[PDB]
Amino acid sequence: GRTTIAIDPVTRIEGHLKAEVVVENGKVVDARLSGGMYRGFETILRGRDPRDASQIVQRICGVCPTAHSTASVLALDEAFGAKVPNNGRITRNLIFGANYLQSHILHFYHLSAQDFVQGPDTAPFVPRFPKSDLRLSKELNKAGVDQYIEALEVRRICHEMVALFGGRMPHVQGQVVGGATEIPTKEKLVEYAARFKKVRDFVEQKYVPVVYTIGSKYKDMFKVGQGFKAALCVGAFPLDNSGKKHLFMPGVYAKGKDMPFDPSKIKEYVKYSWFAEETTGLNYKEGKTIPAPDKAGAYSFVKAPRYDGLSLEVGPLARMWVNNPELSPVGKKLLKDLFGISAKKFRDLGEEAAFSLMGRHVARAEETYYMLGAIEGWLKEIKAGEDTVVMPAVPASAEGTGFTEAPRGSLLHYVKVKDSKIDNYQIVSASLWNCNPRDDMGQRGAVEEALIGIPVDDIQNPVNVARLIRAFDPXLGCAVH
């Protein structure tokens, strides 16, 4: 009865992923995710001037490098005892916030949209599965195509926004220990705001409405992909200089309950990962990275992070669920008009629909709208001309941890400094939380679990396997590093 389907490479994600599922009676009944490429940034970093980390770590991933930059400089700030000036904190938020817009827009249109929208008869939009379950009307499919094309311009403008104070993108030069390297001028602030206005218009008028509208043709996709229904947020985008208030506040949600985040409860397991057996179960402060590509039973270069034993997911759904902000005006209206749902705040979607294949796309669109308001605020808060950096000395001995939220989910970097050089550097990244293999006790990773129950009514056209995976916006470069 059972059929095993292997998909390598899973495409329209970042990086190298193999998915293997077992299908029985038209549904996925088991799953394994394999991250098949390793670079080993945690060992490459050793012995370097710690200030180099904020450049080296960005090369983990050219889609989300500002996230790694941010985590790294936050770790360095702590280890160096550097107090980032108020204006530099805001400048960092403007650099990084612009890439949230870029990344979510890239994800929905250029990675995910072909899951629902039929492209024209030209590579790379053909060939594809003969029965791809593409349900949109002539008009709606055309809207998807036109918006994919427009989004190419919009995501590029987002990178212009990042580069204004960031230097260039991918791989910014503009964030360093102690703040930001370039004070915003009045002139460049006008340039940033002009671009921001165009991005806002696209997000409000095209992107958010299209996700709900496509979602309304795929209501069945809100009923699958729940997985553990457990979420993590470690906080991001500091709104003051005392490390208190953040745009996204930290918290954990599991078994229907909200609880504080305590990073000491993070452990990384490796039984099913290609790393030396003796390195299993380490918290990141004690982390070790010893590759073992021939180890029997292992199936991924992604370690298996667990929070107090729990397998959690991260990303826009996780943050929006944990923080529970008010929904966008257009979202509220489409929920009413298309879904018959009266909703005010994000959790009004209900746990079941929020933690679903389509729910995660909706969360990402809502979060993009939410970020618009934050950037609007920072553009009013920033003061042209005010210094954005301090120049701290390299300490001989120190440690630091930087916590932030990458567009795909929770990210932390830990650095230990000895003899003025990097002694250890450990990275616990977003897609690591989502796309990891089983832990030592046999508990599946978040996406592995969310695959359970996914419908596969046609083994010759098993499109929902990768649709589920793409809803999580996986980045296997980040997950493995």
């Binding site: 292997a6 998909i7 390598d8 490479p9 899973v10 495409t11 329209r12 970042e14 190298h16 193999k18 098949g36 490429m37 390793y38 670079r39 940034f41 060992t43 490459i44 050793r46 370097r48 001037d49 200030r51 180099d52 450049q55 983990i60 991933c61 050219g62 889609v63 490098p65 250029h110 990675l111 492209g119 590579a123 790379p124 053909v126 060939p127 594809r128 995501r155 590029r156 990178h159 212009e160 990042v162 580069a163 104070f165 960031g166 230097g167 260039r168 993108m169 791989h171 030069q173 503009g174 360093v176 390297t181 370039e182 460049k188 590759p291 021939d294 270069f301 950096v389 120049m391 470069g477």
Partner: protein, 277 residues
């Protein structure tokens, strides 16, 4: 209309992303009328063994005529297992095996980005994967297919598109074989096209007068002085960023902070520490 297969090895996808940032007037035309992007894991419609098999069927039809773009380095340690790029009917395909298969049959290979070109970060001190540059890997395995390096971490999109344009003109004027021979003429000793990598950053820097005067910035946010003391590697770097700048001309590394020498064969180790001379 020749096919292009874009293979990712130990890459970060930043070389793909930088290309997505192109405002080159020829970009859309290159993708829609001149070549056909038949395989690219980040953006293509199909997936899995079907995508692999599609690439294979096209490659066979266009033997000797398709182009490879490689993003990221090629790891040779542990029998290639540090980079698996696909699976065909239960058979894993490492980056090593993919280049051994497709490399011999390509018209030419573009090694895009410092990883593919020179090894880059995955090959840096502390690495354990045998991360290898494309030209070196191919040569080590007796594969003589022409390789052009377009480095940078990431490259500017103009360097990638502009190299394609150079090839296009050359191949139109002299045919495939003759054209590639003409492109070889304008490559420096590191396999880089001289139109983009033929000039030194420092020699053309707007802050050179300050360098000469010995006026050095002591904080990044001081934009008046030379960035040399802050670690600028412009003196040892061959790229035209001073001119075209970055992301629609809105900034570049030297104005914003420092140059880290990202296009150079010794990046990153030979350009590190980044924040002192």
């Amino acid at each position: 209309r020749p096919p292009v297969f874009w293979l990712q090895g130990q890459g970060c996808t930043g070389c793909s992303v930088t290309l997505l940032n192109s405002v080159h007037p020829s970009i859309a035309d290159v993708l829609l009328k001149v070549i056909s992007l038949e395989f690219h894991p980040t953006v293509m419609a199909w997936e899995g063994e079907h995508a692999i098999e599609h690439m294979r069927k096209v490659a066979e039809k266009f033997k000797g005529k398709f182009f490879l773009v490689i993003e990221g380095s090629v790891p040779v340690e542990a029998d290639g297992k540090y980079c698996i790029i696909g699976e065909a009917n239960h058979h894993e395909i490492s980056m090593v095996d993919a280049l051994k298969e497709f490399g011999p049959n390509a018209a030419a290979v573009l090694a895009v980005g410092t990883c593919a070109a020179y090894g880059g970060i995955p090959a840096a001190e502390g690495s354990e994967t045998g991360a290898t540059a494309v030209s070196k890997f191919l040569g080590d395995n007796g594969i003589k297919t022409p390789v052009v390096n377009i480095p940078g971490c990431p490259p500017h999109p103009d360097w990638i598109v502009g190299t394609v344009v150079l090839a296009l003109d050359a191949i139109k004027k002299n045919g495939l074989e003759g054209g590639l021979a003409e492109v070889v003429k304008v490559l420096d000793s590191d396999g880089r096209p001289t139109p983009f990598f033929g000039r030194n950053i420092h020699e053309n820097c707007p802050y050179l007068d300050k360098y000469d005067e010995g006026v050095m910035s002591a904080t990044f946010t001081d934009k008046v002085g030379c960035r040399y003391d802050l670690g600028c590697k412009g003196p040892m770097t061959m790229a035209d960023c001073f001119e075209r700048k970055w992301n629609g001309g809105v900034n570049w590394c030297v104005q914003n902070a420092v140059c880290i020498g990202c296009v150079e064969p010794d990046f990153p180790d030979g350009k590190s520490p980044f924040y002192q001379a």
